């Protein structure tokens, strides 16, 4: 493996308009964010009330 | 329920959040608060004690 | 002013009372020279509010000073003791001075052998241009990563045991013993 | 931030050698050893332009005086 | 009480054994060989060459307007590192200003450069190519934009040799539409052991001439492996009608003394790795100020100077 | 930053990572004389728990002492003089006029001193004016084998 | 004050300890290596009290034949002569 | 008066003391102070 | 005090002149001693099951299911655990002391004087022989609070092992050395040992100091407290 | 010597080494690398069927 | 109390096992009384 | 698992007969053991980790109820047939993020690695990129950063190229100075003024 230089540069220079370049990070934080969604959606609060 | 979900790093740069924003904290008074994960016993399984 | 150097006994901001019509002041609690990188006029509310909140972001400079802590990525924390003169430092046959000198009295009783592994791997990957991969539980007891990097380095031309003959910076004449030199990743602490 | 001119270990200045080495990997198809064409005989001042992060081209896209 | 009757000083004899040869010289590189010299004197030579000769380097920076992203002190320091092409001997030292310090400038001490750039958004852009070299104009504050400002007679005294930054190509900072940096730099004579920016030589080191000598002649594969052990050139495979192959040291100077052969089990008995005790191989690399030969001559000159100064004060008492 | 010697590390047991200290100074003359004579660092060599001394040299000193002391060592006149002076530095201490040495252990084909001669020499340099030299036999740490 | 006599000097001015100001081994080691080339030197060793300052305590002990000032004088001179020989030779090498 | 920078719109606002604070062109309610030209001197260490 | 100071600066200067470093090869054993380690480990490849069958009472060629029932029956209790592990620990320790006695004095590359780590160890400077043993030979049994690795409900030491696994590899004994590296299954138990050593890691000084304030040595050499009453003579 | 011990049911679930030292040593442990938490249940009617 | 500083320590092998090397800052900020006799007069006067 | 490999790919994605989240806590019987009983759980908020089911070649998820009863091999090499029913994706999958981002972490005595995590969480690196709009109390940023020469691959995968925390130093282990004992260390003056 080599340091992704051209990747890193043509990453920085033009930020990606498609999606997050590092999905593993979003997955790493996935717990809380999905907790919030399942709160609002997923008929969670409506069950509580 | 934020205006940042689904956003690509590009428009995140259009706002003043870094390219790989994570989300996961409630912003109160400005300071990044967070609810810790805590361990409970198992759901609904009768445990011996 | 934006970017003006402050000191301790120095006003930062000035507000006056309306009724009394007298100016008050705010001094810099901190006790090190700090500048100001930007000041921010916080709209106090939804609107229709005079600027009742201001935000100053002071930038403090901390070069590596005597008494601060360094650590490789092995828990091998150290302390900046004297900042030796660059000429009194020894040198390789190529001559580049050792940017950081640590002691051999740290590795026994600390078992930080992966440090030596990382050192050799760095010495190789730097020369060839390789991003040395070091994922745990790849290298087996059949071939030690030691021997793999030893191949890398003997290909580089250096010693297989990472050693390198050094001349005393102060006496000039070489040491009786070869010396271990590599390229570790050092980050700085902030506890100081 | 920026490529640190006058490397720590070596005494060679390298700050000039950043975009000149970038457009070697970029369009010369040679791997990192294009720096050998640059003339970094050691490894010391060599390991800088190799694994230097040029984060500042991403920090600069944050002008609040962007007028837009 | 012992002098050994051979530790004597004989300027004639020392000089008659002393031999110099300049292997390679350039504008920036130099390597040469000295002989019949003790460790102390070569040590001292490296010692002066590294730090102990003065050289113009930016010291103060009067900032005028800097709205950039890089912090000011960082900008100042980074500039404080770019070299400066000017005769270091055509100057007179800066008397560091004690309290009562303001008026301590002249035109025989220091030099001033300046820069001021506001990256304007370039309107000739077709579409979005975040180069951004072509999207914006003057986005990169290089070293080629630190213009020397003459100070009186300087303009005339160096009219034959106009002073400039020796590398007009370094990128000093980076800018974007709206922001600006404006400042001027003050550069004086300073000695390396005061600040590294005053060390003129990029890299100065000397190697004791290593000697490689086999005791027993190796043969065939061991000869092949042996030549393969050390870098190429140092070992020749002996073209032997008697026997088939031996190895001999062609040029011990190309050799790196990494001591790889000694690692192999069987080779350990054949060869011994000594080093010449008296012969030195200097490798000199200045930065942009002076030519390495002038560096060498100036260094020894300064050592003579220090000898003379101690001598003069010794005469005093 | 306040600087002290290693040999005090052990007694203060401080790990020299940042652990700060209090630095006191007696005002009167009697208190300073008392600190100077009774509780001077030099008068704290045997801990009170048992007679075992705790102040003394550490990893680097014991290491290179082992190396140098080994009989395989040798020194020309240059090394011997430079090293003897380097250890002495009497001026920073005072109380001493001139340095005395020993003859070389070997003379032919060349003069050479051994590190063991060196230790003897330094021990001689501090020999009190009239205090008989030291005679002693005691086990070393490194086993003989 | 460039070079000063320290108060540990012998009455006979045979064991004086020169204290060179604003100097380090650059001159020290060369000086001593030259001095050890003098048969009339019984002792020659340099040190440094502390690197933070630039002071080098120097030492000369010699036979009662000649004192230390002349010894240091001639040693400096011989070293300068070495400098000149080196310079001359090297300069002659290149054109 | 004072001259500031509308954070988002990036527009000089020229607001005065004891005044409602907001961008005049877009309506933003956060504004930085511009950096005037102020003599500051640094060592190169 | 002077003598200490001068010896200090002395060895200091010697450090400037000579040089001393702990390079890599001072850990890599000789291939002869390397395969010595190999032979002895391959021998002890089955010691664990040996001590197991012995302590339980069955023989080494006993049926697998019989020993299975026995082991399940064993470490539902704890005393049975204590005795079993005690046996296993003595056994592994015998093996360990064995291969250590064989390798470290001569199996490694360069001999005592030139080996810079042998020096820093045997000279009392820093480290010990157990350190070179671990780094260069093996790690041994991982005594955590006495016995060893604890057994989970299914009695398997680890989801890497089968239940009622007997091999010392699953018994907290691991063979690898630091020099080459350790296997994940070993890494886990070793982490357990370390972090246990962590969680294992002054009011008396106002008790034993309270009544012991005075206790001074009066001139008559009859040591009292300051009130007048004796505590000791001489 | 309670839960503060690393009882060996964490292999791949929560990191062995990643844990502060001092008093809160052992108490707070971080998750392993890949271990997720399912947060969105599903219908299981076909499970009893 | 008064006349007692508080600082971080770093070791040093050059100085002494006895003496402690102190930065000049404290030498300035730590002072103590001294009667003046006739013979110590020149020292004290110089310090003044 | 089978319907999983179907629904993932082109196969029609019906309401899953048997979703992946559900954990099958089959508890074999034994004296003085856990009360044996099949235990199917579909509740959210459970610890669930993936491995590869060895019979098929597909993904598998289970929680800390089947672990204690499952023979999951650590290595494709370790598998003993007819008993070992699962294989770890990789031993990597046992460590956390920061502890995994550790050169040859399987070498040092574990307390060192533990200090390594606890202190490396306290490093003077970049805390992010968008600093201009951070209203925090105290942040810390280091000016001249570079990625290591030695690294685990996941340091590139996880996008750690965008938060360097240190540099790469020319280290030489040597007892030369005499000031670097009791763990102490020296810093080359030149490399320090040069922007260390
Ligand atoms: Zn370099
Ligand atoms: Zn606005």
mmCIF file of N, CA and C in Angstrom, chain F residues 63 66-67, chain I residues 18 20-29 104 108-123 132 136:
data_model
loop_
_atom_site.group_PDB
_atom_site.id
_atom_site.type_symbol
_atom_site.label_atom_id
_atom_site.label_comp_id
_atom_site.label_asym_id
_atom_site.label_seq_id
_atom_site.Cartn_x
_atom_site.Cartn_y
_atom_site.Cartn_z
ATOM 1 N N UNK F 63 26.244 1.315 33.479
ATOM 2 C CA UNK F 63 26.517 0.665 32.203
ATOM 3 C C UNK F 63 27.922 0.995 31.725
ATOM 4 N N UNK F 66 30.711 -0.372 33.769
ATOM 5 C CA UNK F 66 31.001 -1.752 33.425
ATOM 6 C C UNK F 66 31.877 -1.820 32.189
ATOM 7 N N UNK F 67 31.480 -1.145 31.114
ATOM 8 C CA UNK F 67 32.242 -1.213 29.875
ATOM 9 C C UNK F 67 33.678 -0.771 30.035
ATOM 10 N N UNK I 18 32.843 6.857 23.642
ATOM 11 C CA UNK I 18 32.746 5.486 23.158
ATOM 12 C C UNK I 18 31.464 5.190 22.396
ATOM 13 N N UNK I 20 27.183 3.596 22.984
ATOM 14 C CA UNK I 20 26.515 2.444 23.572
ATOM 15 C C UNK I 20 25.045 2.484 23.194
ATOM 16 N N UNK I 21 24.563 1.427 22.543
ATOM 17 C CA UNK I 21 23.187 1.401 22.072
ATOM 18 C C UNK I 21 22.677 -0.028 22.048
ATOM 19 N N UNK I 22 21.363 -0.170 22.180
ATOM 20 C CA UNK I 22 20.703 -1.472 22.183
ATOM 21 C C UNK I 22 20.048 -1.662 20.819
ATOM 22 N N UNK I 23 20.815 -2.219 19.892
ATOM 23 C CA UNK I 23 20.356 -2.440 18.531
ATOM 24 C C UNK I 23 19.490 -3.695 18.476
ATOM 25 N N UNK I 24 19.127 -4.100 17.261
ATOM 26 C CA UNK I 24 18.106 -5.125 17.090
ATOM 27 C C UNK I 24 18.662 -6.524 17.300
ATOM 28 N N UNK I 25 19.738 -6.870 16.587
ATOM 29 C CA UNK I 25 20.273 -8.228 16.612
ATOM 30 C C UNK I 25 20.524 -8.729 18.021
ATOM 31 N N UNK I 26 20.699 -7.822 18.983
ATOM 32 C CA UNK I 26 20.859 -8.220 20.373
ATOM 33 C C UNK I 26 19.605 -8.868 20.940
ATOM 34 N N UNK I 27 18.593 -9.100 20.109
ATOM 35 C CA UNK I 27 17.428 -9.869 20.513
ATOM 36 C C UNK I 27 17.232 -11.136 19.699
ATOM 37 N N UNK I 28 17.602 -11.124 18.423
ATOM 38 C CA UNK I 28 17.373 -12.293 17.591
ATOM 39 C C UNK I 28 18.337 -13.406 17.967
ATOM 40 N N UNK I 29 17.770 -14.526 18.400
ATOM 41 C CA UNK I 29 18.533 -15.654 18.911
ATOM 42 C C UNK I 29 19.343 -16.283 17.787
ATOM 43 N N UNK I 104 18.663 -18.556 26.978
ATOM 44 C CA UNK I 104 19.140 -17.195 27.212
ATOM 45 C C UNK I 104 20.633 -17.091 27.516
ATOM 46 N N UNK I 108 21.289 -17.019 22.147
ATOM 47 C CA UNK I 108 21.175 -15.783 21.392
ATOM 48 C C UNK I 108 22.462 -15.471 20.630
ATOM 49 N N UNK I 109 22.444 -14.323 19.952
ATOM 50 C CA UNK I 109 23.428 -14.056 18.912
ATOM 51 C C UNK I 109 24.814 -13.776 19.476
ATOM 52 N N UNK I 110 24.995 -12.639 20.136
ATOM 53 C CA UNK I 110 26.322 -12.176 20.522
ATOM 54 C C UNK I 110 26.480 -12.269 22.028
ATOM 55 N N UNK I 111 27.702 -12.512 22.480
ATOM 56 C CA UNK I 111 27.906 -12.983 23.843
ATOM 57 C C UNK I 111 27.862 -11.824 24.838
ATOM 58 N N UNK I 112 28.031 -12.157 26.120
ATOM 59 C CA UNK I 112 27.710 -11.233 27.208
ATOM 60 C C UNK I 112 28.310 -9.844 27.062
ATOM 61 N N UNK I 113 29.625 -9.669 26.911
ATOM 62 C CA UNK I 113 30.156 -8.300 26.941
ATOM 63 C C UNK I 113 29.592 -7.436 25.839
ATOM 64 N N UNK I 114 29.569 -7.935 24.611
ATOM 65 C CA UNK I 114 29.140 -7.080 23.517
ATOM 66 C C UNK I 114 27.629 -6.924 23.471
ATOM 67 N N UNK I 115 26.880 -7.838 24.080
ATOM 68 C CA UNK I 115 25.433 -7.689 24.054
ATOM 69 C C UNK I 115 24.993 -6.568 24.979
ATOM 70 N N UNK I 116 24.502 -5.483 24.392
ATOM 71 C CA UNK I 116 24.184 -4.286 25.154
ATOM 72 C C UNK I 116 22.975 -4.460 26.045
ATOM 73 N N UNK I 117 22.063 -5.361 25.708
ATOM 74 C CA UNK I 117 20.928 -5.616 26.573
ATOM 75 C C UNK I 117 21.246 -6.610 27.666
ATOM 76 N N UNK I 118 22.041 -7.635 27.361
ATOM 77 C CA UNK I 118 22.593 -8.447 28.430
ATOM 78 C C UNK I 118 23.271 -7.574 29.468
ATOM 79 N N UNK I 119 23.967 -6.531 29.024
ATOM 80 C CA UNK I 119 24.603 -5.624 29.964
ATOM 81 C C UNK I 119 23.567 -4.903 30.810
ATOM 82 N N UNK I 120 22.674 -4.138 30.170
ATOM 83 C CA UNK I 120 21.689 -3.364 30.919
ATOM 84 C C UNK I 120 20.859 -4.231 31.847
ATOM 85 N N UNK I 121 20.775 -5.529 31.574
ATOM 86 C CA UNK I 121 20.031 -6.443 32.426
ATOM 87 C C UNK I 121 20.866 -6.965 33.582
ATOM 88 N N UNK I 122 22.010 -7.581 33.293
ATOM 89 C CA UNK I 122 22.764 -8.234 34.352
ATOM 90 C C UNK I 122 23.512 -7.235 35.212
ATOM 91 N N UNK I 123 23.801 -6.046 34.695
ATOM 92 C CA UNK I 123 24.511 -5.058 35.490
ATOM 93 C C UNK I 123 23.607 -4.345 36.484
ATOM 94 N N UNK I 132 14.426 -10.338 29.382
ATOM 95 C CA UNK I 132 14.998 -10.912 28.176
ATOM 96 C C UNK I 132 14.363 -12.255 27.866
ATOM 97 N N UNK I 136 12.560 -12.728 24.344
ATOM 98 C CA UNK I 136 13.391 -13.539 23.478
ATOM 99 C C UNK I 136 12.989 -15.000 23.421
#
